[PDB]
């Protein structure tokens, strides 16, 4: 669980 990971489809 990385809160800085891309949270979008693209």
């Amino acid at each position: 669980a990385n809160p800085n990971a891309n949270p979008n489809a693209n």
Partner: antibody
Amino acid sequence: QVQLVESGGGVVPPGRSLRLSCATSGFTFSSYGMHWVRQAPGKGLEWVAIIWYDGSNKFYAASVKGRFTISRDNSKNTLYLQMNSLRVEDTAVYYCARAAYYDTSGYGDYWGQGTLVTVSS
Amino acid sequence: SVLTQPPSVSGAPGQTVTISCTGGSSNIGAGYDVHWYQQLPGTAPKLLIYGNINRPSGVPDRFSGSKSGTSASLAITGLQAEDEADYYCQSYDSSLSGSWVFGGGTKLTVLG
């Protein structure tokens, strides 16, 4: 055409509950992560929470974890913030923001107009 | 604030002002991108600079961002009354549990 329209703010005593809503149009809601950010009157911005586009992940500021739940309804193009056990120090304008991402960190490319939560006894 | 900004800056119309944003080795020093927001009094923040240096197409050419080491900076050339606002830098800090960290904000006064 990108609209983020918030509602649900008002005046509540400490320990009460409020649900904020962020009703979106003008983009494919289900493709985007969304954030809540807050600002105490006269103070700076504080990130509150994020939800993934697909709802796979939710993260919270330490200041609200255990008390607030972020959620979304893709069929209503709507983001929610469930705020339980409100404290006077939760008094703020709450903003929703559409998630964007650059290379090594994220940012908010569109922001709601804000809704004021006043927690007072 | 993980990110340190001057509480206040000012300038006269036509002048250049610079707003600094100082972090550390787990945020800006770690290479996590910096972004900037403009908040006109009584309005929601608006994106001003993203990915350290990029203007959204709607932002005038007077706004620019730079980043070196543990510091970022926003420069505003050709200062206008409309620029009077609070400015926030924003990044991510690997030593904290949130998606975004903010600077404490800088109040820009345009001495008009």
